[PDB]
């Protein structure tokens, strides 16, 4: 939880610098108003207190400006968190790496001090195997292409299979579709197409 702790630390540290800046003189005789107001009369107490007031107001402005910067940063992060809550908790996102390294299944939110934590649960294909493939299948002069999946071969037969899980199916007419003669396409191979 580095980011949340950095937020907390920055917010608790800017305040500490703000109080620590009350020790500066800003060119005055001292940095404690009681000293100036006990050692000086009206005239020069006024002229020194103007210096102190200018310095302290300036440091206040610096603090407020830094807070505005940090608030803009936090608003950007919060808008991102709202987008993630909408698109990953309230739904399934097709955006890549938006809600986890992998194909997004779902997400859970958990609260945290000054922020939120998302448990993104995702699908990661694990054990890959090589196969010989081809873009098309020439049955009887016409070219066959698959609807879902890709043509794959275990060395002997040809199957259609969906990508991110090996589940070969025998080549049939519902597995595939036909478009034009089997000459135009490059890399096509020869195989039969079972007819149910």
């Amino acid at each position: 939880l580095g980011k949340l702790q950095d937020v907390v630390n920055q917010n608790a540290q800017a305040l500490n610098t703000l109080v620590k800046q009350l020790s500066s003189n800003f060119g005055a005789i001292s940095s404690v108003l009681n000293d100036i107001l006990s050692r000086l009369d009206k005239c020069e107490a006024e002229v020194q207190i103007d210096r102190l007031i200018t310095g302290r107001l300036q440091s206040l402005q610096t603090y407020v400006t830094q807070q505005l910067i940090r608030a803009a940063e936090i608003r950007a992060s919060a808008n991102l968190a709202a987008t993630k809550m909408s698109e990953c908790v309230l739904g399934q996102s097709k955006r890549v790496d938006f809600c986890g390294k992998g194909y997004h299944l779902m997400s859970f939110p958990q609260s945290a001090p000054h922020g939120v934590v998302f448990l993104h649960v995702t699908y990661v294909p694990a054990q890959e195997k090589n196969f010989t493939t081809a873009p098309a299948i020439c049955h009887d002069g016409k070219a066959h292409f698959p609807r879902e999946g890709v043509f794959v071969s275990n060395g002997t037969h040809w199957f259609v299979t969906q990508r991110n899980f090996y589940e070969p199916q025998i080549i049939t007419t519902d597995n595939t579709f036909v478009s034009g003669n089997c000459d135009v396409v490059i890399g096509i191979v020869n195989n039969t197409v079972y007819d149910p």
Binding site: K3, S77, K84, G102, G115, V116, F118, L119, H120
Partner: peptide
């Protein structure tokens, strides 16, 4: 896989 990621 489950991945934890944190936003302020």
């Amino acid at each position: 896989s489950v991945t934890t990621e944190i936003l302020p």
